[PDB]
């Protein structure tokens, strides 16, 4: 099958930015490819026909262009609704198919987030399990890691972690992680901590819990 | 005008088959190839084959040929994409859209859940606000099946600075998710924090009140 490579696989762009995706075919299909906007949670949208040709409607700052096995789409100018995730494909050959996606997420200053911990309810324990929450919250760029600690031991494997879609006002991400432990566990140890890296700290940032 | 109505949301055992829809209108049915593709939140969009309706041929990407089925009834200008032997990896949307030198149209999309985990409501547990200015607080929504949970705050009055994150899935198969709010820390002591929840597959709805210790 056709592998179709994206590049870059992210960008962060300001409006007015000219921005540039690249796709790259490991096959020659000809000027067989068209691109799409997509946005969390919705179904694509069509943006170009052909390699360069503008599908009805679509405003004049979106461009394609491309021949064989590179492709380029290009938005002149970038408007406030641009922001989203783009998608080339190819028709030329069976099976059809699709790149990775680029994500075009706004620019901002960067933002070191706030780091709050939560211990397991009362409530909770009763059932015989206990979540340890840590929040990052409004935090710029998305890349940040948590590791939890209990009584300074590095924790593997008992976590799950998520992270929020942009914020589209104030451009940052919010994470949280929870740390599971059976009630039994979580009673036999006494610190509780998750540890915090991001580009906005010079150094890790820990908040901790003692339980009781 | 041209419209690509999918039938509503899918939850599936493994090993069952499902069967999603698209109603056509504002054009000629018979005219146009109709495809399907799906979308996972971790193998991108995959192409999954076409019909031509009113011409039973139908064709299919190798990877789903063999429990992949397309039809089309020219009479009710409705297209049909039935997979079967279905697996946890088939949990995605699926989409239906007609083709012109690339996809211009696209149905608004199919959620299917592979599981076989059973409808449960879950249980909600406040995330309790700490002993500078800002304060975070929050409710965990724990063990619940299968997916949506909705979560406001103080009956939708409380809407700047929360944050409900996507669910994680467990390995009890069930889903977990939290909501967060961050406010000034003078109002822990004046105002009540309530969070809202409701899971309909359940008819689950819960308030919880968040305070301190």
């Known amino acids: 099958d056709i592998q179709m490579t994206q590049s870059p696989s992210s960008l962060s762009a300001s409006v007015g930015d000219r921005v540039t995706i690249t796709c790259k075919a490991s096959?020659?299909?000809?000027?067989?490819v068209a691109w799409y906007q997509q946005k969390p949670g919705k179904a694509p949208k069509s943006l170009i026909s052909?390699?360069?040709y503008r599908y009805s409607g679509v405003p004049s700052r979106f461009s394609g262009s491309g021949s064989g096995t590179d492709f380029t789409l290009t938005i002149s100018s970038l408007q406030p609704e641009d922001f989203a995730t783009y998608f080339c494909?190819?028709?030329?050959?069976?099976?059809?198919?699709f790149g990775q996606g680029t994500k075009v997420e706004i620019k901002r200053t960067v933002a070191a987030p706030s780091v709050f911990i939560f211990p397991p309810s009362d409530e909770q324990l009763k059932s015989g399990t206990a979540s340890v929450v840590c929040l990052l919250n409004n935090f710029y760029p998305r890349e940040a890691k948590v590791q939890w600690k209990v009584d300074n031991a590095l924790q593997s494997g008992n976590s799950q972690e998520s992270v929020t879609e942009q914020d589209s006002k104030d451009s940052t991400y919010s994470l949280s992680s929870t740390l599971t432990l059976s009630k039994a566990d979580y009673e036999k140890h006494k610190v509780y901590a998750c540890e915090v890296t991001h580009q906005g700290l010079s150094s890790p940032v820990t908040k901790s819990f003692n339980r009781g | 005008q041209v419209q690509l109505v999918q039938s509503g949301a899918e939850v599936k055992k493994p090993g069952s088959s499902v069967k999603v829809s698209c109603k056509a209108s504002?054009?000629?049915?018979?005219?146009?190839?109709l495809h399907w593709v799906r979308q996972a939140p971790g193998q991108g969009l995959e192409w999954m084959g076409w019909?031509?309706?009113?011409?039973?041929?139908?064709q299919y990407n190798e990877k789903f040929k063999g429990r992949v089925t397309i039809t089309a009834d020219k009479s009710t200008s409705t297209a049909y994409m039935e997979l079967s032997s279905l697996r946890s990896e088939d949990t995605a949307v699926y989409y239906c859209?007609?083709?012109?030198?690339?996809?211009?149209?696209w149905g608004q999309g199919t959620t299917v859940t592979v599981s076989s985990a059973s409808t449960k409501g879950p249980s909600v547990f406040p995330l309790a606000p700490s002993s500078g200015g800002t304060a975070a607080l929050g409710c965990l929504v724990k063990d619940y099946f299968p997916e949506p949970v909705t979560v406001s705050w103080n009956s939708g009055a409380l809407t700047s600075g929360v944050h409900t994150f996507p669910a994680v899935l467990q390995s009890s198969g069930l889903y977990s998710l939290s909501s967060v709010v961050t406010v000034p820390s003078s109002s822990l002591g004046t105002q009540t924090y309530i969070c809202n929840v409701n899971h309909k597959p359940s008819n689950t709805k819960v308030d919880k009140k968040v305070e301190p210790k």
């Open positions: 859209a007609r083709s012109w030198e690339g996809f211009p149209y």
């Open positions: 504002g054009y000629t049915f018979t005219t146009y190839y």
């Open positions: 019909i031509y309706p009113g011409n039973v041929h139908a």
């Open positions: 096959q020659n299909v000809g000027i067989n």
């Open positions: 052909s390699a360069s």
């Open positions: 494909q190819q028709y030329d050959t069976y099976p059809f198919t």
